[PDB]
Design a protein around this nucleic acid. Structure first.
Lengths: 313, 122, 111, 110, 110, 110
RNA sequence: GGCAGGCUGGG
RNA sequence: UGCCCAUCACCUUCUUG
RNA sequence: CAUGGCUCUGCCAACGCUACGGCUUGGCGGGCUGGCCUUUCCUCAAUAGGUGGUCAGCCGGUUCUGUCCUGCUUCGGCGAACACGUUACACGGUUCGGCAAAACGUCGAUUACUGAAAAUGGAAAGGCGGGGCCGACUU
């Protein structure tokens, strides 16, 4: 909005927000030690959080706590819409009114509207464990401009390391940003007008399967040197193999679910929980967090963190 | 910030109460609709409904198993009140969808109380 | 100290909540009567705890403070005339938290 | 023995309609009767979560107190006597719960 | 035995309950609390009889004392005269009768 | 006991009129104050019979609650019902019954 | 996702 | 995936008196 | 319900009780619990979205379970494990244009500019998008 966004810590710590954040943080997490210990004195908790954030004395506890997820939700209520507006239409991950489904539809559509002939489908590396958390904060910082939101973003996600912590509302929006770079190297540069990124995977329908392969090389070279994410699950398939984007392989004709893996994992986790084996689950989780770091499984990673409260790290 | 701590932070009491708050949030609207008459039944139901929280919490904060059983007794009495407000209350009080709904919520609180009774019993 | 301090800090809860609890419509008059009995009767819970220096009676004092916070939560959703508006539960919760703090310190001092 | 509650719940189902009826005039007596009637369920419930003879006698007392309430509500005067039938036709119900309570007391005692 | 005390206390209630219903609204809490002490002392006698601990017979005595207190209290409670001093006397006679039985019962247990 | 109650009767006799002056609005606070005031007599009485020191400290808690109620009615009850003077005079009377309760506590924990 | 064991039917 | 049932927030007009 | 309230009155009666004043209790008004206590309805019913399970139609329903598993390739492919034609094989408007001005986005830019300093000021021009726009047809 006129760029700038130079006073977000005022809106992040509005009660009206630290409550929205509260209600969003407690959504589903209302059977957790964190909500239940917070809820006790919870608009007094939110009054000492509001006034931690409004002071610049918010200090994230270790990996999240309820307040930490609430601070994240209170950031990502004011930060999110000022990044998620610079997220080209065709990024289908963790945004509002543009969910998973809308992408399995955009992709299909953009394979129909301009029927296309061929397509690329990449899938960045451990997007979150690979995010510079550094050239991320050169995008979380060409848009924040509020030097306190910026310092709250940098508590909520430190401006070092190489690893956006998987499953943080912050990450989500952030990786849909340190990913949007590649969306803005597809759609802006590269003039790829038909694509769809849901975090890591950037389907890129073409017509010269040789052009998509170019696009992909250009995308990988970019996202590896600017963004530090090493694409690997890439293909340049003709539109016929089906674009395994967002769990639905979406060829112009219908789009059938993929899963099996998700479902297997979902079940594996659920079983582990109701087996008292929540310590080998960390091993399994670490494993599946490797098989899925490549895939756009972030909203899925948030989803699984929301369902079982499982810090995979 | 570190959320305002209560002492004897008991997860089970916090959870049970929060979950039981959903029983109250369901039943209190349909306690407060039992007409003018059946006001004593209502007041007694409301004292059972809203007063079970104290049983849990006194159960939660004073980790003596005596109080949990007496919170189970209270949950049991609350189940009676549903039974009662459904059946024996005569205009209506609680539609059988509501006992079905309420019994689920009290059942959820029943589950948590049971787990809590068990974890203390060990 | 201890009991005297806790009660003077809790008196601020009562001074805040009693007006709220007197405003609760008669319709919500069990809730109200039970809230008032929890509010004004936590003073008894505090009083008993200081009469005894028995950590159980200050956990019963904690239980009452917890019930009082339940009451704040409850009267806020209390369907109609939600006794404690969001603001009144922020204010009250802060006061009860202050009483909570003192109770916690007192529980610890006894521990 | 939780047929106790389910046999008592017909005492309540009989007595509540007419305890409701106990006019405002006799309102403490009603409130106290209703607290005795509907609160014996709690007395029974507590007895069945404990199976300690003390709580079983408390259930008996409440049936005993409930029996008192019938006799009291009898001579409450005016139109609003729990009519002798109802005392009788509730004393039958309370007696049925009394029998089961007695058997339960005995089962625990021996 | 609980049955005797309660039947003699029923006379207190039958005397005091009418008087305790005349205790003015202006003295309504006192009234409702007196009524709850009066009917409700029946419970304390019954509970004392439906078991034996002698501690529950003392609680029956405490309740009568609260009841005797209530008589003395309500007699000369204010300008809205609740209980006439005679009624405290008449009631005190009846409460004394149940007092005697409670005393004998406490003794027989002791 | 007997003397504590007769001295506490003076508290009630002072505070009940003060408690009956509390306006309608603060009627539940009033009801609750009166139940603390008139019902502490029960706390004293029950200790009088059942001498276990457990029962005597509950009497103290009630007086402390009664003392709280004075504080509450003087100030927190918003038309500060009890005037500070009334609080002063009441606290003197409560203090007298406090003294007797203290002596009684001491006599029991010899 | 599927196979199997249940469970709930089949006419 | 379309036909729908669990089920979660809503959107109500409904009168819960 | 904005709860069989009211320590709440007026009236009128009479269970009763009276300290003979009353009170009580019942009518019977009225006042009273937030605009005027409408709203806020709490119910319930009910429209449209999500989440899981299922019908691609009398054998399935429904999870609890136990397990199992996520590739391959001949470079074309194939597979994704009977929701089985993994898709009632046909669209949701994932529709068609016409646009892309604006708003939106993004970049230009936290640049120009202002001001010692951009300091929680601050653009734009422009460029790039479609996310936006206008019809058609359908929804």
């Amino acid at each position: 909005m006129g760029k700038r966004h130079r006073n977000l810590i005022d809106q992040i710590t509005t009660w009206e927000n630290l409550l929205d954040a509260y209600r969003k943080t407690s959504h589903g997490k209302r059977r957790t030690w964190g909500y239940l210990e917070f809820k006790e004195y919870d608009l007094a908790n939110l009054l000492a959080l509001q006034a931690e954030l409004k002071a610049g004395n918010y200090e994230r506890g270790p990996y999240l706590e309820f307040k930490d997820r609430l601070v994240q939700h209170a950031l990502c209520n004011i930060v999110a819409p000022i990044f998620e507006a610079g997220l080209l239409p065709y990024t289908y991950a963790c945004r509002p009114d543009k969910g998973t489904h809308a992408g399995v539809c955009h992709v299909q559509a953009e394979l129909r509207r301009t029927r296309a002939t061929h397509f690329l489908k990449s899938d960045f590396s451990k997007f979150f464990p690979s995010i510079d958390r550094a050239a991320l904060y050169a995008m979380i910082d060409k848009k924040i401009h509020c030097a306190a939101t910026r310092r709250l973003l940098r508590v909520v996600l430190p401006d070092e390391g190489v690893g956006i912590p998987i499953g943080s509302l912050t990450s989500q929006l952030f990786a849909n940003v340190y990913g949007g770079a590649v969306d803005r190297l597809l759609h802006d540069e590269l003039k790829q007008r038909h694509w769809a990124r849901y975090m890591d995977d950037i389907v890129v329908l073409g017509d010269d399967p040789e052009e998509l392969r170019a696009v992909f090389y250009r995308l990988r070279d970019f996202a590896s040197e600017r963004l530090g994410l090493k694409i690997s699950h890439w293909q340049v398939a003709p539109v016929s193999r089906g674009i395994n984007f967002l769990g639905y392989r979406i060829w112009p004709t219908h789009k059938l679910l993929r899963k099996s893996s998700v479902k297997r994992a979902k079940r594996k986790v659920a079983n582990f929980i109701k087996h008292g084996e929540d310590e080998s689950l960390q091993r399994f989780l670490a494993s599946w967090s490797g098989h899925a770091q490549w895939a756009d499984t972030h909203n899925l990673f948030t989803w699984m963190e929301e369902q079982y409260g499982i810090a995979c790290h | 910030m570190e959320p305002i701590e209560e002492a004897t932070k008991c997860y089970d009491q916090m959870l049970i109460v929060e979950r039981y708050e959903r029983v109250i949030s369901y039943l209190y609207p349909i306690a407060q609709s039992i007409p003018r008459k059946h006001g004593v039944a209502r007041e007694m139901f409301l004292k059972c409904l809203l007063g079970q929280v104290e049983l849990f919490i006194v159960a939660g904060k004073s980790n003596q198993v005596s109080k949990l059983y007496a919170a189970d007794a209270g949950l049991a009495m609350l189940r009676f009140w549903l039974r009662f407000l459904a059946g024996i209350q005569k205009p209506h009080a609680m539609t059988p969808h509501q006992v079905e709904t309420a019994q689920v919520l009290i059942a959820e609180v029943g589950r948590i109380l049971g787990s809590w009774i068990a974890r203390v019993n060990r």
